[PDB]
């Protein structure tokens, strides 16, 4: 319209931890995945 404009969510916990593991390393992520799969009963 005019030279004017306007400005326009929130989450936490699980997705935060999921994103945190992404910040890790390659072999560290491999070890973390191996450890996580040790308890997972529906993972291959």
């Amino acid at each position: 319209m005019k030279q004017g404009l306007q400005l326009r969510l929130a989450m936490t916990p699980q997705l935060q931890q999921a994103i945190r593991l992404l910040q890790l390393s390659t072999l560290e992520l491999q070890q973390e995945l191996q450890q996580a799969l040790e308890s997972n009963p529906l993972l291959e």
Binding site: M1, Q6, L7, R8
Partner: protein, 259 residues
Amino acid sequence: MAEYKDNLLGEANSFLEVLEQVSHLAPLDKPVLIIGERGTGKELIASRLHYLSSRWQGPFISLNCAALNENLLDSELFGHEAGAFTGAQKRHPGRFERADGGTLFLDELATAPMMVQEKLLRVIEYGELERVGGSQPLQVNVRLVCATNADLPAMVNEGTFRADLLDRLAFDVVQLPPLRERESDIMLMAEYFAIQMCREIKLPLFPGFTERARETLLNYRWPGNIRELKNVVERSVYRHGTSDYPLDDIIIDPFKRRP
């Protein structure tokens, strides 16, 4: 199927024939243009078209060209997808984008935005609309309905309306009879309005229509086919009448100032 009309606001002289022709063209979804008194027999025309519209579940989209201002009208017309348009956020479904397959009930506001008229000529050019900053166009389908309140050819010759805008649309033009021209259902519509007013105001009985009141109503030009007549009926009802006086000195004209 068949959708019942909300009101029996029809004229015996030629409105029945007009309705018959409209039903003949009702199954067709082509560019349809109506004409009649602004706000009186034109809104009724749109409602009747919606009732006689083919199929169901069609979102009856109605808008006024005087509203939506000027700068923000384009965002609602073409749609809004890019950022900083309508507060950004999600792609704002524009007025044309909001109605997909529904009736686009036009209003004869005769908006001076002939630029908006040219843009709407593209809104119905091949059945598509592109949102603001839209990466790719979108072929949107929706029924088109128009009504008129003035002489479209006079506006085109005088330039008040774009000639190409008129040429593209209005596969047919339908003019509603003037209130001064029909003069058929005057008594019937008066009685129906009186009954409705009595029901709404819980009047114990319809006071009745006097011949002098009938003579004055016939003398009234009634510029508004469905509104000014309805206004006069509401004025007489609010003024009311005694049990003995069915309509003696019934106040048809409300605009008059008191003594």
